[PDB]
Amino acid sequence: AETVSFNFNSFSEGNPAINFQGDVTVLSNGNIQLTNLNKVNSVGRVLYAMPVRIWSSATGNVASFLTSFSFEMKDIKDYDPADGIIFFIAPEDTQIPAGSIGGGTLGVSDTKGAGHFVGVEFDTYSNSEYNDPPTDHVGIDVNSVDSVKTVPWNSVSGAVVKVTVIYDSSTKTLSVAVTNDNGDITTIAQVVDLKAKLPERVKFGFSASGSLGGRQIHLIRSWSFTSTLITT
Amino acid sequence: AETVSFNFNSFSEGNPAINFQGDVTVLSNGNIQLTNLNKVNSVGRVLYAMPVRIWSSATGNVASFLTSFSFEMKDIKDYDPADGIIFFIAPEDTQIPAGSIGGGTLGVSDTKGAGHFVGVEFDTYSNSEYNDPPTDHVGIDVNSVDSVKTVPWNSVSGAVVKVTVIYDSSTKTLSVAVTNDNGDITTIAQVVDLKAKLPERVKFGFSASGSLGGRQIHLIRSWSFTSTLITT
Amino acid sequence: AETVSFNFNSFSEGNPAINFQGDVTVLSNGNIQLTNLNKVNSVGRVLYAMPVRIWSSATGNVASFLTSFSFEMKDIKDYDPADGIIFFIAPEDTQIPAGSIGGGTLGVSDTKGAGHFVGVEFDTYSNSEYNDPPTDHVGIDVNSVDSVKTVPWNSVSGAVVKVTVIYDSSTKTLSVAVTNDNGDITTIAQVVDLKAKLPERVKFGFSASGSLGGRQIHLIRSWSFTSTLITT
Amino acid sequence: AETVSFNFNSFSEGNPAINFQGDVTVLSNGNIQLTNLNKVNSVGRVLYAMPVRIWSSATGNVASFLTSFSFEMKDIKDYDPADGIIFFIAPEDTQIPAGSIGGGTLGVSDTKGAGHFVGVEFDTYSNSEYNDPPTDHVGIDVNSVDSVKTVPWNSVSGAVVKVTVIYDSSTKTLSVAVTNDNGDITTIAQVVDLKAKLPERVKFGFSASGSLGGRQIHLIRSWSFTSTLITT
Numbered sequence: 001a002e003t004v005s006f007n008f009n010s011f012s013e014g015n016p017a018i019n020f021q022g023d024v025t026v027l028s029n030g031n032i033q034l035t036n037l038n039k040v041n042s043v044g045r046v047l048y049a050m051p052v053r054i055w056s057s058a059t060g061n062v063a064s065f066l067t068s069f070s071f072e073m074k075d076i077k078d079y080d081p082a083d084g085i086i087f088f089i090a091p092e093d094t095q096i097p098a099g100s101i102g103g104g105t106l107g108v109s110d111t112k113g114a115g116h117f118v119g120v121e122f123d124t125y126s127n128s129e130y131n132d133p134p135t136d137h138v139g140i141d142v143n144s145v146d147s148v149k150t151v152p153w154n155s156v157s158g159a160v161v162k163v164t165v166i167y168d169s170s171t172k173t174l175s176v177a178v179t180n181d182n183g184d185i186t187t188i189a190q191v192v193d194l195k196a197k198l199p200e201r202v203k204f205g206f207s208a209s210g211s212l213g214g215r216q217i218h219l220i221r222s223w224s225f226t227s228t229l230i231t232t
Numbered sequence: 233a234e235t236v237s238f239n240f241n242s243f244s245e246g247n248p249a250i251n252f253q254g255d256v257t258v259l260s261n262g263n264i265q266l267t268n269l270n271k272v273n274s275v276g277r278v279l280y281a282m283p284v285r286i287w288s289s290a291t292g293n294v295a296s297f298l299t300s301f302s303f304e305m306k307d308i309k310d311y312d313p314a315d316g317i318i319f320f321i322a323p324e325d326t327q328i329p330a331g332s333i334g335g336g337t338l339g340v341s342d343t344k345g346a347g348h349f350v351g352v353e354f355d356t357y358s359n360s361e362y363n364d365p366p367t368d369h370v371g372i373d374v375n376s377v378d379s380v381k382t383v384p385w386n387s388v389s390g391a392v393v394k395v396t397v398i399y400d401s402s403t404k405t406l407s408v409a410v411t412n413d414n415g416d417i418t419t420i421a422q423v424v425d426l427k428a429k430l431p432e433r434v435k436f437g438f439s440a441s442g443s444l445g446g447r448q449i450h451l452i453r454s455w456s457f458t459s460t461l462i463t464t
Numbered sequence: 465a466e467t468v469s470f471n472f473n474s475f476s477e478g479n480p481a482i483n484f485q486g487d488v489t490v491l492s493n494g495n496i497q498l499t500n501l502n503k504v505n506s507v508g509r510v511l512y513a514m515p516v517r518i519w520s521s522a523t524g525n526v527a528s529f530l531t532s533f534s535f536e537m538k539d540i541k542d543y544d545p546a547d548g549i550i551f552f553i554a555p556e557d558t559q560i561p562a563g564s565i566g567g568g569t570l571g572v573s574d575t576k577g578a579g580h581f582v583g584v585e586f587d588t589y590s591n592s593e594y595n596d597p598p599t600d601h602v603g604i605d606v607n608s609v610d611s612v613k614t615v616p617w618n619s620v621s622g623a624v625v626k627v628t629v630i631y632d633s634s635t636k637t638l639s640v641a642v643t644n645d646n647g648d649i650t651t652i653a654q655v656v657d658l659k660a661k662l663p664e665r666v667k668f669g670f671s672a673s674g675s676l677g678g679r680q681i682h683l684i685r686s687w688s689f690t691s692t693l694i695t696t
Numbered sequence: 697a698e699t700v701s702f703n704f705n706s707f708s709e710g711n712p713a714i715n716f717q718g719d720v721t722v723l724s725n726g727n728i729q730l731t732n733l734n735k736v737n738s739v740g741r742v743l744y745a746m747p748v749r750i751w752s753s754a755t756g757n758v759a760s761f762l763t764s765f766s767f768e769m770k771d772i773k774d775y776d777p778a779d780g781i782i783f784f785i786a787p788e789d790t791q792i793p794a795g796s797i798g799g800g801t802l803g804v805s806d807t808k809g810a811g812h813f814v815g816v817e818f819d820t821y822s823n824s825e826y827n828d829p830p831t832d833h834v835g836i837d838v839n840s841v842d843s844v845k846t847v848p849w850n851s852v853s854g855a856v857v858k859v860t861v862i863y864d865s866s867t868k869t870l871s872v873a874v875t876n877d878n879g880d881i882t883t884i885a886q887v888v889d890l891k892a893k894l895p896e897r898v899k900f901g902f903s904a905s906g907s908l909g910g911r912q913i914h915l916i917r918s919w920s921f922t923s924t925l926i927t928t
């Protein structure tokens with residue numbers, strides 16, 4: 001049994017376990033702000049530095065993982081609250097798409113909304129070009145921001161949101177539980193074969209994006225993670 | 233949204249929010265001890281007092297719930313470490329089976345291991361009459377202790393174990409993530425149509441049993457839970 | 465090499481290996497509760513019955529030891545969390561001080577905080593009379609509860625704590641590593657010449673104390689220990 | 697508080713968290729063999745892939761760490777049981793010294809026995825060129841294999857050895873406890889200023905070496921580690 005686990009209650013620059021890409025910034029209170037409020041088409045991403053082996057070709061086993069994180073999104077004057085945050089899994093060479101337009105691409109896909117990642121988005125802006133539902137929502141993304149599945153959700157400015165994700169290797173089920181500020185929970189599950197959509201070694205992280213008129217504060221507050229792969 | 237949420241960091245007798253059935257006893261630190269070490273075929277069950285409505289006949293909706301709790305099993309001299317604990321959901325009128333033989337029935341089924349409940353078992357004893365696997369295991373029980381699905385597990389004496397459970401209403405998926413002492417996680421998931429196996433209002437809880445030659449300490453250390461049913 | 469070694473995963477009354485002093489009591493799960501919540505100025509101490517020879521005037525050799533154990537301090541309604549636990553080493557004839565006021569004396573010193581022992585304290589209440597730091601702390605005591613050195617620490621109600629202590633005869637260094645619940649470790653070390661502070665044979669144990677208003681659950685969960693004295 | 701922790705009960709090739717250098721090999725039982733028995737001047741090293749930040753120039757704080765590991769050394773016919781294993785800490789660009797002669801350099805130093813590392817050696821061959829004591833021994837190495845301090849020790853072929861290391865940032869004390877097969881423990885402590893001997897970012901690992909006539913099996917069986925650096 002090969003297990004990877006870490007726990008972040010706050011973050012600090014210089015920590016060799018976290019990689020910053022784009023407009024990412026660490027505030028004085030240890031929180032991570034993903035986008036820069038003064039940039040058009042801002043994109044910020046934070047990844048756990050070490051790649052995690054989610055499956056072995058030698059045994060054909062896929063890993064199971066449990067992870068929880070909390071974030072906060074807050075409105076700012078004049079700009080439209082957009083675009084959202086996405087928790088993703090991508091190949092180890094993952095980088096911000098060249099000529100990224102930000103916005104509804106959430107910093108992980110091209111203009112068509114395509115890319116190489118699996119993820120869970122917290123979408124706060126309805127992009128008709130990517131078939132977004134008409135309300136804020138949570139969706140499961142498999143190589144595209146045109147979600148494979150979505151559930152109505154509500155983003156509340158300033159509210160701390162808690163998320164718990166469980167990926168069960170056997171059934172290949174990815175389950176998500178979002179605990180809203182007011183106590184109500186939102187859930188969504190989708191069968192995704194990680195061994196067929198991603199390489200043996202991947203990277204986990206968070207990404208957020210904005211546009212010219214759509215900008216908001218995107219904060220990643222804490223993050224704990226554990227993956228366990230059977231080796232037999 | 234109809235939401236039911238509670239959080240116990242310790243328990244105390246008298247708390248009208250919990251119902252004690254059988255040999256249940258509360259230790260000095262608020263831990264609940266399920267079985268009595270001096271009784272033969274001991275059975276102890278703790279339940280949340282208020283009934284939770286998991287589904288509606290009018291709308292046809294089913295609730296989603298997120299729950300985590302930590303427990304502990306410890307060995308006792310001269311007795312085989314058995315039988316184990318089960319997180320269960322049953323009708324509001326639920327009671328310990330009449331003339332229960334404890335042992336492999338986990339305090340939720342008859343002699344055959346049949347009953348009207350749904351639960352996740354943490355079985356430390358292999359009962360061939362219930363087609364138990366040859367090792368410690370986690371199992372999804374639907375109206376019987378002859379698990380619908382099981383997964384190899386290892387119960388460590390004196391170790392505090394943490395469990396997270398997410399039930400998604402849309403997919404009808406019950407996902408279990410077990411964090412063992414050493415860090416490793418064990419997962420199991422199964423599709424269970426609650427709407428078909430239980431009445432609209434049910435009760436949640438834990439149960440554990442022992443027999444003549446098989447007994448061990450069974451403690452529940454904490455319990456948080458939140459469910460949300462959509463009313464539309 | 466004279467070696468003394470033991471390991472208690474649980475404790476049962478009557479085990480001739482353990483001496484109870486004061487308000488000690490064993491729970492049904494095998495944990496030793498050190499204080500009584502119903503008594504004013506409560507004191508309890510648990511000692512390993514067979515005295516251990518830490519040095520010898522014949523050779524001049526001092527022994528080295530390695531020991532680890534786990535405890536749990538939990539808050540109770542209406543009382544201030546006080547006063548903490550201490551792992552101590554004392555003369556073989558040691559007893560709870562006459563007219564023990566409990567409190568900041570931790571059950572091992574007089575009203576002035578003086579005594580004849582060497583120990584590591586997990587202090588959860590600040591006593592200005594004994595020059596206690598303003599926060600919970602781990603300390604190295606040498607014939608006084610007015611610690612020779614302290615280190616900020618943080619006690620978490622309900623959390624299981626793990627400690628490892630190493631005493632090296634050649635440098636005469638006493639080292640401690642506290643593994644908090646969340647995974648962080650706290651350390652503290654100090655040069656304490658054991659052969660100049662205690663008789664050739666001493667007893668090892670734990671002690672806890674309460675006051676009029678400060679009372680809390682103090683549980684010793686497990687203890688393992690090894691000493692080795694070179695006989696040449 | 698910045699904490700790094702991992703736990704290895706076995707090892708497997710492909711794990712992106714471990715780096716192999718030299719003649720390292722993973723056996724079927726998950727154990728790591730460091731040297732190749734058919735090569736003259738064999739050298740094998742295994743490092744935890746991610747660099748650990750042991751101190752911050754921003755705050756001037758040093759990290760505290762607790763680590764335990766177990767190894768086994770076994771004789772083989774015809775060859776002299778040599779040369780030993782060394783648990784070391786070195787700069788992130790650490791590699792096997794070019795033109796390494798293996799042997800008493802233990803794979804971390806040049807012919808003069810110099811290098812850039814801090815470590816704990818389990819030396820099974822007396823090299824007079826490096827001022828080795830005449831018996832097997834445990835020593836603390838600071839930039840050289842001519843140990844700063846050593847303690848007599850005995851290597852027992854085939855015996856599983858358990859080691860526990862604690863480094864306390866405040867006193868800058870490095871303490872080692874070696875639990876031999878027969879129960880006896882050996883200890884050694886030395887004050888080493890890590891912030892004055894190493895760069896902010898380092899790597900932890902194990903190295904073993906042999907020579908033409910001196911070869912033996914060197915196995916690393918398990919390894920757990922936790923470091924915590926205060927960030928304030």
Ligand SMILES: OC[C@H]1O[C@@H](O[C@H]2[C@H](O)[C@@H](O)[C@@H](O)O[C@@H]2CO)[C@H](O)[C@@H](O)[C@H]1O
Pocket residue numbers: 080082083103104125127210211212213214215
């Ligand atoms: O208003 C929020 C959305 O903005 C969209 O981009 C805008 C752009 O910000 C604005 O400068 C004007 O050009 O029109 C564009 C298209 O409507 C993003 O594409 C969308 O995702 C939100 O950020």
Ligand SMILES: OC[C@H]1O[C@@H](O[C@H]2[C@H](O)[C@@H](O)[C@@H](O)O[C@@H]2CO)[C@H](O)[C@@H](O)[C@H]1O
Pocket residue numbers: 776778779798799800801821823906907908909910911
């Ligand atoms: O005998 C074990 C030690 O060997 C020393 O090197 C030897 C070499 O193996 C042997 O062939 C002899 O000819 O010459 C060398 C010098 O004695 C190593 O130097 C020492 O580290 C041990 O492994």
Ligand SMILES: [Ca+2]
Pocket residue numbers: 083084104123124125126127132
């Ligand atoms: Ca969108």
Ligand SMILES: [Ca+2]
Pocket residue numbers: 315336355356357358359364
């Ligand atoms: Ca059974």
Ligand SMILES: [Ca+2]
Pocket residue numbers: 547568587588589590591596
């Ligand atoms: Ca005090």
Ligand SMILES: [Ca+2]
Pocket residue numbers: 779800819820821822823828
């Ligand atoms: Ca040598």
Ligand SMILES: [Mn+2]
Pocket residue numbers: 121123132133137139145147
């Ligand atoms: Mn979307």
Ligand SMILES: [Mn+2]
Pocket residue numbers: 353355364365369371377379
């Ligand atoms: Mn079973």
Ligand SMILES: [Mn+2]
Pocket residue numbers: 585587596597601603609611
């Ligand atoms: Mn104190």
Ligand SMILES: [Mn+2]
Pocket residue numbers: 817819828829835841843
């Ligand atoms: Mn040496």
